[PDB]
A paper describes a structure:
Here, we propose a method for generating proteins and protein complexes with complicated shapes using fusions of alpha helices. To design amino acid sequences that can stabilize the alpha helical structure of the fusion sites, we superimposed one or two turns of terminal alpha helices of connecting proteins using a molecular graphics program. Then, the amino acid residues important for forming a fused helical structure were chosen from the two natural sequences in the superimposed region. Our method does not require complicated computer calculations for the design process and can be used for the assembly of artificial protein complexes with predictable and rigid structures.
We thought that proteins with alpha helices at both their N- and C-termini might be fused to generate artificial repeat proteins by connecting the C-terminal helix of the repeating unit to the N-terminal helix of the next repeating unit. To test this design strategy, we used a protein A domain as the repeating module and generated 3-, 4- and 5-module repeat proteins. All these repeat proteins were successfully produced in E. coli and could be crystallized. In the crystal structures, all the repeating units were connected as designed. The twist and bending angles of the fused helices were very similar to those of the ideal helix. Interestingly, the protein A modules in the crystal structures, especially the last ones, exhibited significant structural variation, and close structural analysis demonstrated that this structural diversity was due not to the helix fusion but to the intrinsic flexibility of the protein A module.
Author numbering: 33 to 221
Amino acid sequence: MKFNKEQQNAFYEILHLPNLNEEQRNAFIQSLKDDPSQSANLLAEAKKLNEQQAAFYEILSLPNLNEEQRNAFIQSLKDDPSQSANLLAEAKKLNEQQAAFYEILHLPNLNEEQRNAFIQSLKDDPSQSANLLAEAKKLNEQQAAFYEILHLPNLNEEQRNAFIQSLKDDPSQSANLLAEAKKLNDAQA
């Protein structure tokens, strides 16, 4: 009973699954050699095992996880690998939320009252992290435009004060005003 094209492809794909050690790979290959008619499920299992382990590795790559939380996720994944996907989601979720903390804490152009508002508001409900982070960034970039137009070397005071005043009036036009200031600055080198 040789292999049909389907069993041949299950064989091939199992042979090329990246995160399987040699003992797992050989076990699957010998079980496939003994009873090829299980190929399909032996593939699925070999795929499932392959992705659980991939979850492992992704947990080990998230930059804003400290090693406590990380080893908690790792050990929980060794205790029951079935739930790997749920664990992985939580691993990413917490990571991004902590990423939100980090960035918001280090935004150069927020005065510390706005920052303390963003962080406290992030501690209250972490689920809003993304929505909050953008709010921080957008706010940062807009205040950043002010000091930027303040310190462009080749501007004179009426140019500066027209851009600044126009930025004070309508901050959402920052990207335009800034982009008009820069171009004018290079115009007056």
